[PDB]
Amino acid sequence: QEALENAGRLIDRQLQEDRMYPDLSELLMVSSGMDMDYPLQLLSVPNLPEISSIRRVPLPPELVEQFGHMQCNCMMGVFPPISRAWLTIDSDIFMWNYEDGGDLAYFDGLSETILAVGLVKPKAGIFQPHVRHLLVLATPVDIV
Amino acid sequence: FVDSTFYLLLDLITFFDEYHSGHIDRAFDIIERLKLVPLNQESVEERVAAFRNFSDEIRHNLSEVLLATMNILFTQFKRLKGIEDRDSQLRSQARTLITFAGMIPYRTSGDTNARLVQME
Structure with a gap:
């Protein structure tokens, strides 16, 4: 009867x-065939379009310049937690701020080619448990 | 709305405090946060579309926002001495900014002397 209790109950x-x-997901949902609202055309689904492209950011030329010479190997990727992008050319690695682009970090530590890089969480209890993330880098010889 | 403009004015002011008294890097970060000036791509024009819309109070302030950007951008990007140096960004930023300034000079006081700071 009281409105206040009443409102609380409704919410x-x-x-x-x-x-x-x-x-x-349920198998029953599309057992016969999938309902699809599928247009080939961009913005074909006028009102409905799930995604839009807000912006495009080019790789900064300053970053690219230190990627100019690469005999052996190239690779790049985005680190999801960092909101940073990474570029690997041979031995060197770059990390650049997604939002900024001017801000870039460079690893000079690695002596050899970089096979792979990855972002990982720290262990539950080591000296660096505190750090938010760890960067694993593997070269032919070593993993840092 | 009233509060929003208020905060913007305060943000711009904090940018001032840190602009000069060094802290070049910090100034860019804050200016970008304002979301007034195109740091990204050629989205400079969207910055045109959203410009006329701007409230009277801000519409007036933009002149200094630009040129503050081309300053820090200049000084920070002093050509360095003798490795990852992405000069390219903080360079693209000037470019987008200039296109921006180029589009609205008429609706601005009349100092595209951004050009002086722009070059060297």
């Missing part, structure tokens, strides 16, 4: 309903 009920919402 709670609705909250419950929101939580109950059906599971995303």
Whole structure:
């Protein structure tokens, strides 16, 4: 009867309903065939388009310049947590700020070609458990 | 709305405090945060579309926002001595900014003497 309790009850009920919402994937959903709203054309789905392209950022030329000479191997990628991008040419590695681009970091530590790089979480209990992330870099000879 | 412009004015002011008194790098970061000036790509034009929309108070302030950018951008990007040096960024930023300034000079006081700072 009291409005205040009443309102609370309504929200709670609705909250419950929101939580109950059906599971995303079920075999039954598209057992016959998938419903698709599929246009070949960009912005073909006018109102509905799930994604839009907000912006394009080119690799900074300053970064590119230190990638100019690469005999052996190239590779690049984005680190999801960092919101930074990395470029590997031969031995050297660059990390550049997604948002900035001017800001870039360079590894001079590695002597040899860099086979692979990866971002990983630290162990539960080591001296560096505190650090947010670890950067693993593998070259032919060593893993740093 | 009223509060929003208020915060923007404060942000711009903190940018001032740190602009000069060194802290070149910090100034760019803050200016970009303002989301007024195109740091990204040629999105400079979107910055045109969103310009006229701007409230009267900000519309007036932009002149200094530009040129502050081309300054820090200049000084920070003093050609260095003798490795990863991405000069390219903080360079593209000037470019986008200039296109921006190029598009609205008429709707600005009339000092595209960004050019003087721009070159050397």
